[PDB]
Design a protein around this ligand. Structure first.
Ligand SMILES: *[C@@H]1O[C@H](CO)[C@@H](O)[C@H](O)[C@H]1NC(C)=O
Ligand SMILES: *[C@@H]1O[C@H](CO)[C@@H](O)[C@H](O)[C@H]1NC(C)=O
Ligand SMILES: *[C@@H]1O[C@H](CO)[C@@H](O)[C@H](O)[C@H]1NC(C)=O
Lengths: 348, 50, 44, 44, 142, 97
């Protein structure tokens, strides 16, 4: 359980002069806390196993900043062994008082993975213009997180996959869903106000996609602040489920600052090829024998058997073998994304 | 002739060119431990893998 | 009138057929939205 | 005289085509300011 | 049927001195939830207002048969003890979590006059997990 | 159990691209085409290539591969015997102007 902190300069490859502090205890987790110091450095809070915090650039200035704004900083921790979640908050001094707590029975549910929004994103539009020049506002909730579980009693009549959407601060479940007859290794994306997860159906022996969107309503509730200790009313979930003709490996979403341009989904097939899929094709609000509003809204009814044609494959003959992962980074031009596929063999 | 052969941990088999690091053929089979090699032998033109 | 207008309306077409697939500049006063599809004319 | 007919045309075209209203006002919104901060994840 | 204990707390220093605040009565057979409550003594009222004057927290706790949650005191006592509980469970039946939220909104500061708050105009509902729909093959067909 | 197969190209002198085949579904390699030591069920195989296309086949092993369509589980198009694939030229990943 020991832990070590190595600090350096990524340009030339050298250790820096400042020596890091010596960790005595097993570390659990860490966050980055973009607030700065007088030298333009983030602060990197680390949490001990005895629930004590350490702040790496521990200067006086940072400490007064913290003695001011500590109670707006919350940690969340998760252990899959016994299946329990916990959430702590700071104090004026650096300690932690348990705030919320939550369990899951480890005999019918076994956590697989946990996701949270990338902090380094910016979103342009707070609303979606409806057909008749109306507006549908969307619920963002920075501090949200998605949790995915699967069963223990694996047998292809009684298998099920579980989803939970939580707030990190309070510990209240927005949504709690179950998709039966599905077991497989899952693949998830949790972006600005939407969620996608891929799984495998044992009752028609085929892969599948499922998509979620969150919309609050027609009006705005404290449009300027969004404190998560003030929203009683929970939003309305939309969702939908499509099928997919193949298997999957690492999946990711594009990114660029200012969030303007359309967002795609980068899929890693098993054959090594990559696929770019438009998010606007996976929309739960799809006419389904259209009215004229949907017709105007050009919502492309309910595409059957979402298709695969080799005209949108990035890697023509540059296949990557195993493709355990993908990384997407933003340029400064706002029309390009920089892609890196890592497996047994690199691509860029 | 120009070449050498390896058999790695990642279950791969390669046929590198012995003038510059470059591959002629990989035959990667299986990440997980049901293709892991246990022996290797060269009969002067061919190979043998277990 | 005709002589005035026409060699001005024939050239806009040439341009928008030539310099089509990109953006040019920004006007510092907010405009109305319905007029979008004819001010950009290449963009998707 | 001219005022009346002019504004009548204005009002009719607003009543069917023009007005600056909600959808148009949408793009004049700065985004909210996150007040609370949550970071963490698995237990490494 | 089953019963469930329920504790509550609020202090000046955000400590834990959980005490009982009535019990829940849950029918397994058919989903039904009911509360049995006692109304506040006056010393608790005073302490609670002194808390709300500091943006402290009202904390609630129940057992697994643990689980907790919290909400500011201001957004509660400015609402004349209007609150709401949700009790989330699993597919097979086990307590999973507990949420306590007030109606409406948050703090403005306006005085309550401190005679309203002996009612506990509360409300409870459980909610199990919603299933999720298949891919609606009909429109896929035509 | 096992899966026999032939994997042919019309006139392209196979041997070269044998250096870059890895059949998935359990993984197999080329000579012709064989996959040893599997269980029995409804498995869909394809012949991977980075510069070629090969339509998949849905075996339902006694061997019978009927068709892959993914919409209507119950369907039989009775493909005779093992994984003839027709090597449908080069796939077009490039796009003109
Ligand atoms: C909005 O939130 C801010 C910060 O929490 C608060 O100061 C303001 O009073 C709120 N206004 C409304 C209308 O909710
Ligand atoms: C990849 O394929 C394209 C055509 O499909 C071909 O032009 C190119 O030379 C190939 N690359 C390599 C390295 O063989
Ligand atoms: C009790 O809850 C209802 C729910 O709408 C609310 O109308 C009522 O005002 C609440 N009671 C008090 C005393 O606020």
């Amino acid at each position: 359980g020991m832990s070590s902190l190595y600090v350096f300069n990524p340009i030339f490859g050298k250790w820096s002069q400042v020596a890091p502090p010596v960790l005595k205890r097993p570390i659990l987790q860490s966050l980055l806390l973009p607030v700065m110091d007088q030298d333009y450095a983030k602060v990197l809070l680390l949490i001990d196993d005895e629930y004590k915090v350490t702040a790496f650039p521990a200067t006086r200035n940072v400490l007064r900043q913290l003695h001011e704004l500590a109670p707006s900083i919350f940690f969340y921790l998760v252990d899959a062994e016994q299946g329990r979640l916990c959430g702590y908050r700071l104090r004026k001094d650096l300690t932690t008082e348990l705030s919320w707590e939550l369990t899951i029975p480890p005999e019918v549910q076994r956590i697989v993975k946990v996701k949270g929004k990338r902090s380094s994103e910016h979103v342009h539009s707070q609303g979606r213009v409806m057909g008749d020049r109306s507006v549908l506002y969307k619920s963002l909730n920075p501090n949200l997180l998605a949790v995915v579980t699967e069963s223990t009693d694996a047998h292809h009549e009684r298998t099920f996959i579980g989803i939970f959407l939580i707030d990190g601060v309070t510990g209240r479940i927005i949504h709690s869903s179950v998709q039966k007859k599905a077991k497989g290794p899952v693949h998830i994306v949790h972006s600005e106000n939407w969620v996608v997860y891929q799984y495998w159906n044992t009752k028609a022996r085929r892969n599948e996609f499922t998509v979620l969107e969150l919309y609050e309503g027609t009006e705005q509730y404290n449009a300027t602040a969004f404190s998560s200790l003030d929203r009683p009313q929970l939003p309305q979930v939309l969702q939908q489920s499509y099928i997919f003709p193949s298997s999957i490996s690492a999946m990711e979403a594009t990114i660029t600052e200012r969030g303007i341009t359309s967002r795609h989904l980068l899929i890693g097939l098993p054959s090594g090829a990559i696929l770019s899929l438009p998010k606007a094709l996976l929309d739960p609000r799809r006419p389904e024998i259209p009215t004229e509003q949907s017709r105007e809204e050009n919502l492309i009814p309910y595409s059957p058997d979402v298709q695969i044609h080799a005209e949108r494959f990035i890697n023509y003959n540059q296949t990557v073998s195993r493709m355990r992962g993908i990384y997407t980074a933003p340029s400064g031009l706002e029309s390009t994304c920089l892609v890196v596929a890592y497996g047994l063999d690199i691509y860029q | 002739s120009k070449k050498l052969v390896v058999a790695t941990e990642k279950n791969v088999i390669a046929a590198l060119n012995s003038r510059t690091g470059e591959i002629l053929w990989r035959h990667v089979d299986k990440g997980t431990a049901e293709g892991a090699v246990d022996a290797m032998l060269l009969h002067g033109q061919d190979v043998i893998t277990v | 009138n005709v002589t005035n207008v026409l060699p001005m309306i024939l050239i806009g077409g040439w341009i928008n057929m030539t310099f089509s697939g990109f953006v040019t500049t920004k006007v510092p006063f907010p405009l109305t939205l319905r007029f979008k599809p004819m001010l950009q004319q290449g963009i998707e | 005289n001219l005022m009346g007919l002019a504004l009548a045309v204005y009002k009719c075209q607003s009543m069917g085509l023009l007005p600056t209203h909600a959808s148009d006002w949408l793009a004049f919104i700065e985004p909210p300011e996150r007040m609370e901060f949550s970071g963490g994840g698995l237990l490494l | 049927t089953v019963g469930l204990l329920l504790e509550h707390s609020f202090e000046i220093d955000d400590s834990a001195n959980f005490r009982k605040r009535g019990s829940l009565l849950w029918n397994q057979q058919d989903g039904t939830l009911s509360l049995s409550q006692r109304q506040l003594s006056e010393e608790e009222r005073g302490r609670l207002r002194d808390v709300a004057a500091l943006n402290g927290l009202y904390r609630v706790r129940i057992p697994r048969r643990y689980v907790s949650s919290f909400v500011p005191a201001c957004s509660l006592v400015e609402s004349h003890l209007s609150d709401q509980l949700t009790l989330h469970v699993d597919v097979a039946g086990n307590v999973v979590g507990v949420s306590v939220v007030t109606h409406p909104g948050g703090c403005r500061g306006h005085e309550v006059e401190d005679v309203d708050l002996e009612l506990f105009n509360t409300s409870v509902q459980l909610q199990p997990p919603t299933t999720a729909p298949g891919p609606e093959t009909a429109a896929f067909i035509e | 159990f096992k899966i026999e197969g032939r994997a042919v190209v019309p006139g392209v002198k196979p041997q070269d691209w044998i250096s870059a085949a890895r059949v998935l579904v359990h993984v197999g390699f080329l000579k012709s085409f064989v996959v040893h030591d599997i269980p029995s069920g409804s498995y869909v195989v394809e012949v991977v290539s980075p510069a070629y296309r090969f339509d998949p086949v849905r075996v339902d092993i006694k061997m019978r591969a009927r068709y892959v369509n993914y919409i209507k589980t119950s369907e039989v198009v009775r493909l005779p015997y093992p994984l003839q694939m027709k090597s449908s030229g080069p796939p077009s990943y490039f796009i003109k102007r």
